[PDB]
Design a protein around this ligand. Structure first.
Ligand code: COO
Ligand code: COO
Ligand code: COO
Ligand code: CL
Ligand code: CL
Ligand code: CL
Lengths: 563, 563, 563
């Protein structure tokens, strides 16, 4: 019961059973993964008010609220370790990511009520804009589990003012609404000022019976004397339920407890528009034919070692099927259609290894996998443009060391072709996922559907084998200091300092702490994130191309048969 | 469980029990209504192939297919008697309108397979554009029940070429898709060329086992000899199921019979995005407190007699509740918020009767209800702009004889203010319904949310008391011939000819035959159409304003309390 | 001083000196052209008030006003003979088209004040929407030279009401404004009601000293007695200069005479935004290397005779240069880049003649030039998509007899591929010109950038060799009557009636009278119209692709070199 099985079913299959497992490689990858998990655990556990203390006082934690809301096994956290301003507990005081609620994907933001009653901390505003941006690009409902004491007083200069500070999400919430994207909030505890605006800016307000939202909240001997007197007067926190339910009616519903509020949220989520994904499927959902566990052997932690990208693709997409666009033209890249739970995606991935008699504009040359040349750049421009027309979302798998350099490359137009790809991406007007397999380096990181495409890249993830840097430390040390060495030990020291710094500041955990990559994910979580992304992208897309009117499959076929 | 009951619940109630029923008026209205129903019946019955003959040959009729698809009681036909080119059977060979399918509103178009196998006839293309336009403005799924033999050969010049001819709907179907609006088709019988493109242009193709779609179909003694020989060869009609299911896979699903195809359509409709309307409700749905049957007495067929518009509003909207914007300012109009099945709409309606000491720019004057003056025009500009910001759809109830005329009116800016209203409407970017209660005349018909607003007016309906004309025949006769009478019986004859022609060409049936109004509806069907429109408008709106962020209720309240 | 001369300069040159001139063919084409010119002359001359009479009374005619406004030689009329409702003088009472004003292209509409003081006549509203649509798609200023007495009283039912009646242009004027497209009006004579709204709806109002605009204007023995008395009272026509200049200030400027008003218009046109076209040029403007006069021999009036489309392209585009996309693939079409006054356009044109060993999905077959097959349809889809990305406007040259038919064609996906082209066009979001060289027939007329693409086709023109019909009369007669002949002289008569009717109703003049084609243009005017269109399209485009970021030239080059 699908369109065009001749094009979309029984696609060529790729990959091979793993014959040479690598236990040492697996151990190295898992060591990175374990460190990430341990760091996340510590971060979520930290704070003056423990989960136990919260629970005794009648509150659930961020994770308890999230777990209560979502379908088991569907949590896809983002920015777990994001902490660009080096806050002591390792977080931006929110928990965010994608979760599924009775089959419907939603974007979730939860205040961390363990830490300073969910205060705005340095870096939080940037984190919040990443959330609303993802919801904007995917046309996906945004859900707040809010428990927010507003500006952290000692850090007001970093969280209160500026273009991308604490006030920006309120405008972003109005933008979402005006684009037809609902925002639902569960309101817990005390939400004054900054917290008040987080409460009132959404579409739907569900409140806990003891919660409040307000323009301003209740917040040496005379100060002590004033505080004890007012506390005996029993004056209620401003904007409590008797006000915002009974008087203003801004609270639409009130529940007795945290789980009640969650159930109210679930009800409003049930009201939201969403396709049954069957509408957009071209096949029944099928698991890959090869296990993801193999990725622990396939993807080398030895950054000098190549691997077969087809083996990775085979383990991430439905039934290990892949319909390659222009195989043999621009051999440094793979571009083609694949399926994720029966839904079409365009996949663009670097090829590793050495490419004999390549590229075509050089004589007696060998091509370097991971690099971009003329044909690969033109092929990608074409493929992005075709998928854009067909409304097929793009998934980019990065492992790159840059576009080819030198005047032969310049004459082959590579600078113009890389920027043409940027133009093609900006033109696509569709949500896209970027997954860094190993290397994100050079301007190639930008052109390969990088996160610098703020209108198209929803967010980015990376494996434990990933690393980010402008270029290798040794190359940078040469570029920085080669002229200085000639003109002139102090320089030599600076070079070794640089080489070490490039290593330190390119490690996966560091990269995600700074937000270069939103999340480091386990090898066995890559497909789950692809699934969440793709299902979210097709849940309520704002444009359609009927299958029988798609160009990508037709052009792909013609290249196969005509030449 | 609704926002702001203080604003949206227990609104002022309007209208009064009917104390003086008018049997003669009721009889006159019902005579128009009966004529409409009888004309529709005859039109649907007409054709060389009867419903019985179709059924015996294994086909359902247009109405049988529509009735099988929709929820009982939800059929809201449009353009039933539309026939601008005076086709002999009184129709454009399609049946169209709004229907509900398991709670989801959809726009429906069905080929009339009784008449020339559903051929394209003069006027059909215009009718089809009205269908896709309505779907476009409401973001509503478009459903084709297709059985279309393409261009009617003898009338090819009127149905084949031109900007708004038979090819235009194919572009319109691609536009719908690109706007994220699905088009689903059930494909019945033979659909060649023009019918083929109607088959392939939608998003989802569901075919009858014996149906076909093709670029070109199978279509003196040598001609007879050729036809008998080819018929014995049993060559299948091009593009049958063995081709478009088995080979091209363009038919997504195939069913054994007409009801099967309908059930397949129902399944794909079940997949489509739609809010549970509860999301947008401000109250539980409530019937009006006064019966619609009273409208047969309230609205006078005597076009010289005034009536109380509040009595009409009271019978069309939930619980006879109405929250008037700027009551007492621009008394010639009523502007305010009301509810339709718990959903907010803005209502704009003419006031009839004589208005003492009005308008304000004239001395010792009386205002004429049905006319537009300075304050009414400014009030409407403001109200349209407020509703636009609040994403509240507008329902216009027309009964008008024009904007005030003369240099006093000119100095009061009326020409500029009427056009300002046009600008305000064009700016609103929301779907709107227009309902002609009695008079649609002068440029006032345009400015009062008229159907000339092709980006906002979804369609228009009128009661049996309606009439359309530039101005009264007598006034026109004077304007046309007064100078000629002075400069000079032949002129007198021309004047009486004109007066009679204006009467003839302004009757409800004539108006709808020409498409001046899309449908003449029974008094007891006005609320049903309002309900269909409003529920359709809120089913998948592309923009939201949270209730607590709405300006119209706040501005309304301030005018009441501040002055 | 241009980007990428390697791609855009010294393109391959095409065409050959004409060796066999055809005087009889030239005479036949010119006979059609002369008839068109004579019909236009008669139409413009007709009316109760002659140009001389107007001039004596202090008014210029439509053509005098247009000629005063525009740069000599730049008048490109459209809809000259448009008269779908068969008005007696052969027109819709407006003169419209493109003209240049001190180097800036504008769209012009002038009221014909010779005929019923510029009254709204049947067909005029449709004509006016074609004007504002063209301005909308090109983002081009719209200029009204207005002298409009409003609704023609005897024909009110055809000009006053309805979705696309006299009120629609007022909404269209507000739409233009809201899209950032200025509308400038010169207001002449008396403009009441309908004329009043045409006066007030534009952005800039320039009035003649004796002109007026109003909601309502001044318009048996008692009628005579009333008219003589009021005429002696000297009551001024409502909305004259003392009101709309001195009181309301709606008239921005007032001039003493018609040429003054024109000069005021010229001043406001000078204020409008427009690129110096040099910005978008890739070469200095160059005439074709071969004379357009040859087209009178090249394009056969014998509709059975083929010709070389390259010879036509060579005579229409700069320096007879053409950069063909995918030459040798889909040989039934030519797709490629060309230059018009140094500006890039994409050209798509049918190839005529017989194509050996074609198409590829049939065995031992010959392809028919003028028809569309698999590769041509795929090539066009790709080219349209590439030009769309590159922001390069498309010019379609039609001479077509339809997409290939039969189950071999169906299996090759032709129905799906034709609709894919429709989707690709709708997706392009750029203005496009369509030029019918000879045959506009079948659904191919729609898919080849036909005027049925209401968001992209600005207008369409045709040569004296053009003809429009669903299919040939003989084929239609067979399709209509072959089954009836078998089942059964009266039928034979019907067939001959049809054959003759198809001939009569497909002649160039008839086609343009009905608006199937907006203008029949002389062979030597085709390039002038292309020049006006292209310069208008690049005057204030709403999107840009830098030359060095264009994909079409790169993809074209790769196909040439890679295979
Ligand atoms: C434009 C935007 C402007 C603004 O946002 S201005 C900020 C407005 N916010 C306030 O006034 C909050 C005042 N707080 C209360 O009423 C808050 O106790 C509260 C009512 C929530 C929470 O009160 P609780 O009694 O429930 O306290 P908790 O155990 O949940 O919180 C403990 C902790 O959080 C700290 N806390 C709470 N809010 C903040 C903030 N904001 N900054 C730094 N630290 C904070 C508080 O000082 C406490 O510190 P320690 O005693 O040292 O453990
Ligand atoms: C760009 C677009 C181009 C075009 O659309 S070109 C038109 C292409 N269409 C065709 O070739 C259809 C040829 N018809 C069949 O094969 C058609 O019988 C058909 C196969 C459907 C239907 O065949 P049936 O045997 O089922 O015939 P019906 O009883 O359903 O139809 C009866 C009636 O419809 C008439 N009919 C069917 N189609 C048309 C049309 N189109 N115009 C006028 N009259 C039509 C047909 O002549 C018959 O006339 P009478 O014998 O006088 O009663
Ligand atoms: C929603 C929209 C509503 C409407 O538009 S309602 C129409 C409002 N228009 C009027 O009232 C115009 C009345 N006319 C004048 O004042 C008009 O003379 C006028 C003031 C212009 C022009 O007056 P002139 O003295 O300058 O007359 P002209 O020589 O320019 O025009 C001659 C001709 O046009 C005719 N004419 C002018 N306007 C119309 C119209 N509209 N319909 C049919 N025929 C018309 C007029 O009858 C005359 O007919 P003949 O005597 O038989 O030659
Ligand atoms: Cl690079
Ligand atoms: Cl009016
Ligand atoms: Cl065709």
């Amino acid at each position: 019961m699908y369109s065009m099985p001749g094009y979309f079913q029984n696609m060529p299959t790729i990959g091979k059973e793993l014959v040479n497992p690598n236990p040492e490689n697996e151990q190295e990858i898992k060591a990175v993964e374990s460190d990430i998990h341990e760091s996340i655990k510590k971060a979520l556990d930290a704070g003056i008010t423990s989960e136990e203390k919260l629970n005794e006082r009648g509150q659930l934690s961020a994770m308890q609220r999230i777990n209560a809301l979502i379908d088991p096994g569907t949590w896809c956290p983002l920015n777990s370790l994001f902490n660009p301003e080096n806050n002591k507990f390792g977080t931006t005081n929110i928990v965010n990511g994608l979760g599924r609620v009775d089959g419907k994907w939603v974007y979730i933001v939860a205040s961390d009520n363990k830490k300073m009653a969910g205060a705005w901390v340095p870096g939080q505003a940037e984190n919040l804009i990443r959330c609303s941006d993802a919801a904007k690009m995917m046309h996906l409902p945004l859900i707040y589990l809010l428990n927010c004491s507003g500006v952290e007083f000692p850090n007001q200069d970093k969280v209160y003012p500026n273009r991308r500070g604490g006030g920006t999400p309120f405008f972003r919430n109005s933008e979402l609404n005006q684009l037809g994207i609902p925002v639902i909030v569960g309101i817990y505890g005390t939400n004054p000022a900054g917290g008040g605006y987080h409460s009132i800016s959404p579409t739907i307000l569900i409140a806990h019976q003891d919660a409040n939202m307000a323009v301003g909240g209740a917040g040496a001997e005379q100060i002590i004397a004033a505080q004890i007197e007012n506390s005996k007067l029993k004056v209620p926190a401003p904007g409590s339920v008797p006000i915002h339910y009974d008087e203003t009616g801004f609270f639409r519903e009130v529940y007795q407890n945290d789980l009640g509020v969650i159930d109210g949220i679930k009800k409003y989520i049930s009201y939201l528009p969403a396709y049954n994904l069957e509408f957009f499927r071209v096949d029944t959902p099928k698991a890959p034919q090869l296990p993801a566990e193999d990725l622990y052997s396939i993807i080398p932690m030895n950054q000098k070692r190549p691997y077969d990208i087809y083996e990775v693709i085979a383990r991430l997409f439905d039934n290990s099927e892949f319909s390659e666009y222009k195989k043999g033209y621009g051999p440094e890249m793979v571009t083609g259609l694949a399926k994720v739970n029966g839904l079409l995606v365009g996949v663009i991935a670097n090829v590793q290894g050495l490419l004999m008699n390549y590229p075509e504009y050089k004589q007696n040359s060998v091509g370097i996998g991971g690099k971009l040349y003329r044909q690969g750049l033109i092929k990608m421009n074409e493929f992005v443009t075709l998928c854009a027309r067909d409304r097929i979302p793009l998934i980019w798998l990065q492992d790159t060391t840059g576009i080819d350099v030198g005047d032969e490359a310049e004459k082959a137009e590579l600078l113009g072709l890389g920027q043409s790809l940027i133009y093609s991406i900006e033109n696509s007007k569709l949500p896209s996922l970027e997954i860094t397999i190993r290397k994100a380096s050079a301007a190639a990181h930008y052109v390969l559907g990088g996160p610098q495409g703020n209108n198209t890249n929803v967010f980015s993830i990376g494996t434990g084998a990933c690393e980010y840097y402008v270029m290798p430390g040794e190359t940078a040390a040469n570029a920085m200091y080669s002229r200085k060495l000639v003109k002139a030990q102090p320089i030599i020291g600076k070079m070794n300092d640089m080489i070490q710094m490039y290593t330190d500041k390119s490690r996966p955990k560091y990269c995600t702490e700074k937000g270069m990559v939103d999340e480091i994910v386990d090898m066995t979580e890559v497909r789950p994130y692809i699934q969440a992304f793709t299902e979210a992208a097709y849940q309520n897309p704002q444009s359609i191309c009927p299958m029988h009117q798609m160009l990508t499959p037709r052009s792909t076929r013609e290249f196969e048969t005509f030449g």
